[PDB]
Design a protein around this nucleic acid. Structure first.
Ligand SMILES: [Cl-]
Ligand SMILES: [Cl-]
Ligand SMILES: [Mg+2]
Ligand SMILES: [Mg+2]
Ligand code: NA
Ligand code: NA
Length: 332
DNA sequence: CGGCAG
DNA sequence: TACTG
DNA sequence: CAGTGCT
DNA sequence: GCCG
């Protein structure tokens, strides 16, 4: 399993012997991403991780092609950056890219919405404010534009997780709440706070979003809601905005999901990430005739598959033939 | 040639 | 994979 | 449904 | 973009 990142520790990227190469490829990858070339950007992402994890500085066209995640096209850009120190294509990125990046950083606006605004002639958030037709989400996103681009100290994430846990455990002391995402992976700063809630009795998790959200709204803790389907009663997730009380506090993104205990480990695995780690592991499950989601690890379906027993993260690693990784080692 | 997570 | 419209 | 966001 |  040298071809899968979920099989390796992410700490390999700590000693990156190719920054002068990857720093330029990241710029190309971002241009493709904001321009909508989802797959070309994905390939660039995997090559940047392969290069970041390689043991030595790359020096040879042959050496480069041998690396999984690097083919002929990528090799030639490498040999170009090594020989000449610069990469010519970086001076031929569409001039539209910076504006596209500006717009697609509005929460709720993606590549298709950005490309449309650009075609209609908008070039600044000012134009967007005053001429674009915005969705309820995009309007909130626009209003917290800077805040949603800002990361917070992991100490503030702990306060936010504690706020949620105290509210939830107030009306059911048996609830378990866990902070996931970059927080659980050990990062010093967190872009948002990802809270996982369940009840170990297998049933008391049902019908608690309503109680929890009202409790957290009665405190003024929640300032905006991005996604919160709370009419059908099948609510699985919540995405919104919060702010801790007092001076010098910023608006922070908050994601909550409630899960039945039977799905804890898979829910825990998905929410802890990283995202590329998840896509790698899930891609690995497919090859082994399995299917991994936030709900379960299961076998392929009948042209309804069996659900494999996964009481802990460890068991999901074991069933996929992978060495276990601490959450901090899944930071791909 | 087509998938690329679910 | 779960939302929105 | 297309588009978007979550990890 | 890369991969099988
Ligand atoms: Cl991979
Ligand atoms: Cl576990
Ligand atoms: Mg996060
Ligand atoms: Mg989140
Ligand atoms: Na290769
Ligand atoms: Na966006």
């Amino acid at each position: 399993l040298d071809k899968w990142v979920c099989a390796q520790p992410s700490s390999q990227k700590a000693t990156n012997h190719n920054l002068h190469i990857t720093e330029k490829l990241e710029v190309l990858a971002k241009a493709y991403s904001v321009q909508g070339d989802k797959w070309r950007a994905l390939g660039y992402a995997k090559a940047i991780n392969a290069l970041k994890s390689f043991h030595k500085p790359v020096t040879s066209y042959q050496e480069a092609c041998s690396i999984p995640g690097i083919g002929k096209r990528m090799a030639e850009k490498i040999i170009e950056i090594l020989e000449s120190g610069h990469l010519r294509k970086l001076d031929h990125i569409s001039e539209s890219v910076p504006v596209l990046e500006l717009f697609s950083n509005i929460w709720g606006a993606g590549t298709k919405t950005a490309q449309m605004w650009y075609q209609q002639g908008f070039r600044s958030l000012e134009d967007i404010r005053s001429q674009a037709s915005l969705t309820t989400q995009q309007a909130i996103g626009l209003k917290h534009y800077s805040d949603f681009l800002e990361r917070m100290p992991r100490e503030e994430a702990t306060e936010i997780e504690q706020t949620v846990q105290k509210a939830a455990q107030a009306f059911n002391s048996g609830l378990l709440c866990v902070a996931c995402g970059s927080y659980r992976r050990g990062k010093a700063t967190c872009g948002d706070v990802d809270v996982l809630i369940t009840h170990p009795d297998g049933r008391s998790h049902r019908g608690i979003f309503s109680r929890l959200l009202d409790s957290l709204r009665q405190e003024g803790f929640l300032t905006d809601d991005l996604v919160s389907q709370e009419e059908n009663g099948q609510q699985q997730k919540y995405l919104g905005v919060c702010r801790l009380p007092g001076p010098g506090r910023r608006h922070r993104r908050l994601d909550i999901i409630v899960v039945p205990y039977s799905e804890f480990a898979c829910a825990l695995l998905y929410f802890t990430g990283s995202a590329h780690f998840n896509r790698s592991m899930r891609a690995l499950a497919k090859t082994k005739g399995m299917s991994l989601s936030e709900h379960a690890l299961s076998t392929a379906v009948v042209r309804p598959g069996r659900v494999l027993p996964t009481p802990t993260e460890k068991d999901v690693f074991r069933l996929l033939g992978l060495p276990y990784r601490e959450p901090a080692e899944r930071d791909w």
